[PDB]
Amino acid sequence: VDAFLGTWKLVDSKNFDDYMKSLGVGFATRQVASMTKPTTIIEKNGDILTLKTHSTFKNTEISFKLGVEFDETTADDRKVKSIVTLDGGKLVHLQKWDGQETTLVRELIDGKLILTLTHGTAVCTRTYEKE
Numbered sequence: 001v002d003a004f005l006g007t008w009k010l011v012d013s014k015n016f017d018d019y020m021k022s023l024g025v026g027f028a029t030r031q032v033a034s035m036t037k038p039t040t041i042i043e044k045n046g047d048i049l050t051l052k053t054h055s056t057f058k059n060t061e062i063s064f065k066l067g068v069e070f071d072e073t074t075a076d077d078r079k080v081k082s083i084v085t086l087d088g089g090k091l092v093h094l095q096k097w098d099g100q101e102t103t104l105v106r107e108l109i110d111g112k113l114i115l116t117l118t119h120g121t122a123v124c125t126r127t128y129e130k131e
């Protein structure tokens with residue numbers, strides 16, 4: 001887990017609109033989100049990880065242990081059952097609600113953090129650089 005820790009800033013985004021549309025996010029929220037560049041902070045205290053996502057529009061914070069389910073309320077106000085695991089060196093976050101699922105996968109490639117978001121047929125790639 002240790003290579004993920006730190007402060008990251010968004011530098012590139014592809015197909016986030018498609019992703020948000022698939023989740024049912026309304027057009028006005030999609031407008032603002034398309035212009036927002038969040039900062040993600042990942043910290044550890046023992047076995048507990050904390051993931052903070054900060055922006056001018058909305059802020060979220062979750063704390064969790066790897067491999068243990070937790071309740072999460074997402075930025076778009078879904079109430080989901082989540083689990084985060086390490087798989088092939090990737091941090092894989094699975095959210096389940098109402099029989100649906102979405103995955104948020106983070107991988108480090110060339111020192112950058114690549115976040116891939118999948119729901120239905122929509123696939124979004126967001127690139128973060130370390131601050």
Ligand SMILES: CCCCCCCCCCCCCCCCCC(=O)O
Binds near residue numbers: 038040057060076
């Ligand atoms: C918390 C602020 C991050 C982006 C805010 C705008 C988006 C809110 C509506 C869509 C939310 C979809 C789930 C969260 C996607 C996370 C993206 C990211 O960490 O880069």
